[PDB]
Amino acid sequence: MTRFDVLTVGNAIVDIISRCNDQFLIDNQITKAAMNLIDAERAELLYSRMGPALEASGGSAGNTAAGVANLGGKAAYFGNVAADQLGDIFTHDIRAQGVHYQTKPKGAFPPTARSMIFVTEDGERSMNTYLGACVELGPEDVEADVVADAKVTYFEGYLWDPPRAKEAILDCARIAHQHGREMSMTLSDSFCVDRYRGEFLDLMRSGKVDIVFANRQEALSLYQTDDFEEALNRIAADCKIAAVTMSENGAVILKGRERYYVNAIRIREVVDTTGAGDLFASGFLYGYTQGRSLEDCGKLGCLAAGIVIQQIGPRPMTSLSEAAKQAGLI
Amino acid sequence: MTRFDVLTVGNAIVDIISRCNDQFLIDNQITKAAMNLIDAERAELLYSRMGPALEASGGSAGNTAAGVANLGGKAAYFGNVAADQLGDIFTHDIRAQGVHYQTKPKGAFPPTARSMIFVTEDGERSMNTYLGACVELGPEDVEADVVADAKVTYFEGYLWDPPRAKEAILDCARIAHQHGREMSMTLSDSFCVDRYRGEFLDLMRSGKVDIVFANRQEALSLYQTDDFEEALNRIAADCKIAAVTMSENGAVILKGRERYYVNAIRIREVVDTTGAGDLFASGFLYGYTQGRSLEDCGKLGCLAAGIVIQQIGPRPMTSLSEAAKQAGLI
Ligand SMILES: Nc1ncnc2c1ncn2[C@@H]1O[C@H](CO)[C@@H](O)[C@H]1O
Ligand SMILES: Nc1ncnc2c1ncn2[C@@H]1O[C@H](CO)[C@@H](O)[C@H]1O
């Protein structure tokens, strides 16, 4: 027995969500479908231009941990908030889902991170993130016992942006591997890959990271290639297991020379694509820590991803375990 | 030439919204479908038992002002928040909708009001409100010029719960009538009517309030009768205009001896009933200040109410002015 199936580690963020049109993105120099990093002043400026919004707990790794708990897995999370109302909200949501979350705030300032997410009529999301208290996440926030007791530890590529989070992750990898556990990462965003391509490859090649998540764009960007087949071949050579999502074209899971394709789920209405990749990882890692085939892990991933894009907010409000059972994923 | 069509005055609240079952309400002694007032400690207790939530600006009068702005009217709002993150969200949302909002916060404690709203599978909402900063709303928060320049000033029955808000409302009535404008109120909630029925009747009979909004239960409650026909006849005798909503049975508008019955719109499906009454008042008062017939004002209320119950959150995120056009009402 282990205490946890999946520990995740990431930027603790509250999402501020509003609808807009494509012209709004252009007028404001917001890169569509990307994670745009912003300072405190620009956050205020974008907020002043934004329509009425809804707030929902987010953060890539936070969403993933919540999705694992929703599916019936045992999940934990490390991530730093401030002692403020947004922090109280984040703390509440993730704990209310049954995730172990014990990272202690370090005061009220800087405040808890927010991402201004503009959702266009096609359901695509464009995020604009002020990292706030996330910049504080460091080695002191690693609960060594938790990493040791977790079957998989999963972290965001996004964590290379704040300064000391990488040191926490290197500690995680050491502890995880000392206990025969596995490490996993997501590439997060193509622009993040642009920033850290070489460091990400080295994490993979040195064996610090075992299982890598990417979408098509991130995989292309990792090798700065336009040839998807080459990207798949190279990613398979660089890590133990790769799981690559291809939007409305499903997913492919790679392990050495084996490839497992997962068919493209049909979506009646896309409300908001926020959290799709995060919930793919939830379904995959839940499957993986239950000992399911790689194909079934892929299927569980696409199931969760398909559900989250049919609602507002990045964490499914319906029962994923119920959906998985109806789907025969057991 | 007036500056505003509708000024509203109410408790400035952020909604904390979560799904639950009927049993949860029973277990927690929450009165289904009512506004339950709670202290700080009970708010924390209920929060600790609530599932993951979404936050959305609320407040009955706040929602009504937002709705009037959405339809294309010119709206203002008086309501008190704290200088905290929840207050910043409230301030942002109402201003982003184009509502004039200039009430000044009076420090960080008490904090901005929150309502824990539990939504059952039938879409009904049961609210649990900690008034926080709302207790500080008083005569000093009346912008005399705004009241003078508003066609209708509308306020919540809910304002009789905090101590000093009533003095502000009496000032509004004096100013509005001196300038030849009209006063309106909503009865808010059947238990609120239980608490203040004598005060409310005095407001109506003294002519401090011209137009009264109520649902069926509130109207029955005002006269402590089971006889709805008697409730309508009496309410017509006690105010200049009454608008009484009857849920799936629509509404009835009463002026002296005139009655106009109006149908509810056909609902796709009830998601969350929060704000239905507030948005009925938005549509009615929008129509009213545009000089529409009483029947057309009823029609606009039913449309607006009908839209809000088909989404999460109490303030329509789609265009009410658009929907009014497509339904041939504008
Ligand atoms: N810099 C970031 N680091 C981690 N997660 C982020 C970042 N920016 C946005 N997100 C999260 O991505 C999630 C969807 O993938 C959103 O809920 C949002 O909170
Ligand atoms: N005491 C109160 N006063 C005014 N509005 C309230 C109160 N409690 C809940 N509400 C609001 O009622 C709205 C729905 O009518 C919700 O959005 C909620 O914020």
From TrEMBL, chains A, B:
A GO term, aspect molecular function: nucleotide binding
List of residues binding adenosine: N11, D15, G59, N63, T129, E156, Y158, D278
Keyword Aminoacyl-tRNA synthetase: no
Annotated positions binding ADP: N215, T245, S247, G250, G277, C302
CDD domains assigned to the protein according to its UniProt record, in alphabetical order: adenosine_kinase
Cross-referenced InterPro entries: Carb_kinase_PfkB-like, Carboh/pur_kinase_PfkB_CS, PfkB_dom, Ribokinase-like
Domain of life where this protein originates: Bacteria
Keywords: Kinase, Nucleotide-binding, Transferase
Residue stretches making up the Carbohydrate kinase PfkB domain: 57-316
Pfam families named in the record: PfkB (PF00294)
Family assignment from sequence similarity: Belongs to the carbohydrate kinase PfkB family.
Entry protein name: Probable sugar kinase protein
Organism of provenance: Rhizobium etli (strain ATCC 51251 / DSM 11541 / JCM 21823 / NBRC 15573 / CFN 42)
